From TrEMBL:
The chain holds residues 133 to 193 of 193 of the full protein. Coiled coil: none annotated. It comes from the Bacteria. This is SsrB. Residues 1-57 form the HTH luxR-type domain. The lineage of its organism: Bacteria, Pseudomonadati, Pseudomonadota, Gammaproteobacteria, Enterobacterales.
């Protein structure tokens, strides 16, 4: 739910600063989610996992 919304925006690009501006000033809170998010799909980091949700690995848009 929470890791789905972020992983959703993250997939479409959204480091943290943006997430904090979208979700709310809580880059820290995300840090906790980022970890869980990875332990959900089983990746590594938000960056690596970001591509997971992407499933393209282009980084063009």
């Amino acid at each position: 739910l929470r890791e789905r919304q972020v992983l959703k925006l993250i997939d479409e690009g959204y480091t943290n600063h943006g997430i904090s501006e979208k979700l709310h000033i809580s880059i820290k809170t995300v840090e906790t989610h980022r970890m869980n998010m990875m332990r959900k799909l089983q990746v590594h980091k938000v960056t690596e996992l970001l591509n997971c949700a992407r499933r393209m690995r282009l980084i063009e848009y």
